[PDB]
């Protein structure tokens, strides 16, 4: 799961560690299992989430 998430996030301008920090600073609690499942099936949902993380650590 972690390697698939890294692969997907680097396509949205992030890396794995910065995106995990961003999701924690926003209070999102998705598994790494559902995150990878989204990364392969629903790219638009994965981008919604990556934008929320990018705005969280923009402070």
């Amino acid at each position: 799961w972690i390697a698939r998430i890294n692969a997907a996030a680097r396509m949205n301008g992030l890396s794995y560690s910065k995106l995990m920090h961003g999701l924690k600073l926003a209070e999102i609690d998705i598994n790494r299992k559902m995150l990878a499942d989204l990364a392969v099936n629903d790219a638009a949902a994965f981008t919604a989430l990556a934008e929320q993380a990018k705005d969280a650590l923009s402070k």
Binding site: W1, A7, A8
Partner: protein, 145 residues
């Protein structure tokens, strides 16, 4: 035993790429090429399946070596006959037979089993600016790493 995707044999498309090797140190270019051949940049990565792309390396003659590697880094070989080490080569490979150079760097950064040996047959290396593979319509990759 539940739902995580696993890819199949001929299901994930493989694209062709062109990478340019003028003034990139040997190992940095070689690390990036090695990750692209294994498919690590695609969320469909599964370890018992092959999902990497093909790579063309152009301008291997102008690859960079820092320090005194061009004279002091040596490649050895044994013929398995008594007293038969061959320490013949140095950065002479970069002058003559610069495909050997790039290939032996990329080969040591791939797994050592039957999948990693089949992923090595997607590297095509050229000492000059021109390749013979224009019918596969390859796209340019740009390195900064």
């Amino acid at each position: 035993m539940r739902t995580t995707y696993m890819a199949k044999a001929g299901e994930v498309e493989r694209k062709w790429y062109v990478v340019d090797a003028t003034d990139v140190p040997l190992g940095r270019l070689s690390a990036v090429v090695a990750s692209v051949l294994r498919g690590k940049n695609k969320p469909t990565f599964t370890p018992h399946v092959d999902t990497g792309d093909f790579v063309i390396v152009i301008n291997a003659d102008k690859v960079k070596l820092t320090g005194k590697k061009a004279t002091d880094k040596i490649y050895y070989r044994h013929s398995m006959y008594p007293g038969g080490l061959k320490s013949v080569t140095a950065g002479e490979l970069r002058d003559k037979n610069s495909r050997r150079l790039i290939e032996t760097s990329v080969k040591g950064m791939l797994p050592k089993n039957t999948l990693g040996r089949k992923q090595f047959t997607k590297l095509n290396v050229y000492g000059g600016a021109e390749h013979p593979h224009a019918a596969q319509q390859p796209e340019v990759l740009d390195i900064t790493n």
